[PDB]
């Protein structure tokens, strides 16, 4: 269902939005997903940690 709904919309237009995540660590990163030899993550998701 998710694959179908993205496909039918036909656009990846993304607008960043400012959520108030006061109190947690943002921009979490992992060694399983390396961009330019640095640890990174899915560009559109924001990994919150302690």
């Amino acid at each position: 269902s998710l694959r179908s709904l993205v496909a039918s919309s036909g656009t990846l237009e993304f607008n960043n939005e400012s959520f108030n995540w006061t109190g947690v660590t943002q921009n979490g990163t992992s060694s399983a997903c390396i961009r330019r030899s640095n640890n990174s993550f899915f560009s559109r998701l924001n990994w919150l940690t302690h």
């Binding site: 269902s1 998710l2 179908s4 709904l5």
Partner: protein, 50 residues
């Protein structure tokens, strides 16, 4: 998504098949009706001739 796509697809397939059937039905019947009316005149002409 998935289930709604199927319901949509079922109706679209069905509509195309009935729309085809209706177009062909009139076309077949109409050609034959015009041919049958012509036939009766020819039969009358031939009957008078005979």
């Amino acid at each position: 998504g998935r289930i709604q796509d199927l319901e949509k697809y079922v109706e679209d397939t069905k509509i195309d098949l009935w729309s085809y059937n209706a177009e062909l039905l009139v076309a077949l019947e109409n050609q034959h009706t015009i041919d049958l009316t012509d036939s009766e005149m020819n039969k009358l002409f031939e009957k008078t001739k005979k």
